[PDB]
């Protein structure tokens with residue numbers, strides 16, 4: 239078993255290291271998204 | 285309730301067996317954490 | 332009746348209860364069908380081990396944990412796909428193995444919340460997350476090496 | 478079957494509105510009118526023919 243193909247490279251980015259968040263909806267399937275739902279605002283804390 | 289059912293299970297028989305619990309819960313007016321905690325407190329014994 | 336707001340069935344993979352009228356994949360085939368069969372980019376989410384096989388470069392130390400926050404930009408490792416479906420990650424002298432994580436079916440939206448100003452920021456939806464990967468150290472190799 | 482509201486996720490009950498039967502939640506104004514036929518079969522296990530003993 240040798241690496242015949244798919245010798246993909248891996249790079250690292252630090253531009254959005256402190257600005258990247260992962261939001262997931264456990265109750266909303268992946269089929270329906272909130273792209274069409276108009277948003278108003280979001281309250282957050284550092 | 286969707287999250288609760290997903291945690292319990294996604295099998296047809298699982299949902300069929302858990303249906304009665306959801307029905308008994310919906311019969312009452314308990315839908316929020318505050319109401320559920322108030323009910324639990326009312327049902328709590330004195331220490 | 333609106334078609335994009337129908338009732339959803341419990342099974343997130345078979346929410347199509349009413350119509351107008353999935354075998355478990357592997358990482359090698361996923362990458363193959365993402366690169367050759369199509370060319371559209373895809374957002375992936377991979378879980379790396381706690382400590383990477385490196386040292387924090389001039390980070391004031393100790394054998395502490397070395398995460399991506401200490402490494403710099405540029406080429407850090409390679410992704411190899413051997414025969415029989417083996418998918419490895421050469422991140423230096425050691426080689427981890429990448430496997431398919433829990434198949435999430437619920438909505439996962441990747442967003443960057445940049446607080447450019449102390450009073451107002453910007454939330455930018457970069458894309459959607461569909462697949463999950465897990466990278467694990469090849470403990471068998473690490474043990475049989477020495 | 479068991480249906481849930483896409484908005485909040487609570488259980489949906491079948492009620493009668495002003496035009497047609499509909500699924501509705503007890504915690505939000507969300508509703509869904511019934512357009513075509515909807516069925517939920519269970520296929521209960523039938524009683525097999527108990528053969529003679531002996």
Ligand SMILES: [Zn+2]
Nearest residue numbers: 482485502505
């Ligand atoms: Zn609802």
